[PDB]
Structure 1
């Protein structure tokens, strides 16, 4: 779809049997989601944004149905205000920035 940016670019995802709503973020190198129940092994990791750093659980190799498109990658779960899809999955679903 073509998304124009007058409103936040939100899109529905299905992760872990679960229906979520996430923000399509080109200035996010990483995918970070609010605390949720996810099956598996996780590593601790820390990431920065403006304001500073949060600790997150890097889950590796999680399938995500991003707007009907399946992708598999590293998903970080942690105490974010909004669910963020970062360029590690945006390149998977073929997303480009156009102006």
Structure 2
């Protein structure tokens, strides 16, 4: 599909068993999800956005379907207002910018 940028490019994702709305975010190196209690091991991490840094939990090799396209990789979980799909997963679904 093609997604214009008139509005926030929000799409439906699936992770664990839980559809969510998430932002396709070319300016994000990583994928950051709103607080959720995912199973399995994780590592503490700091990530920095416009306001400064926040603490997150890094989970690896988590399957996540984005607009029906399967991906699997690292997801960071913490107090973000918005679910973010970053480049680590956008590449897996063959997403490009075009102009």
What is the TM-score normalised by the length of structure 1?
Answer: 0.98
Deviations 1:22-76 (A, max 9, x none): 0000000000001012111010000001010001000000000111111000000
Contact 1:13 1:21 in 2 (8 A): yes
Q: How far does residue 91 in structure 1 lie from its aligned partner after superposition?
A: 0.3
Q: Distance in 2 between matches of 1:17 and 1:81?
A: 20
Runs of 5+ in structure 2 lacking a partner? Answer: none
Query: What value does the CA root-mean-square deviation take over the aligned residues?
Result: 0.5
Runs of 5+ in structure 1 lacking a partner? Answer: none
Flag as ranges the 4+ runs of structure 1 deviating above 4 A: none
Q: Distance in 2 between matches of 1:46 and 1:16?
A: 23
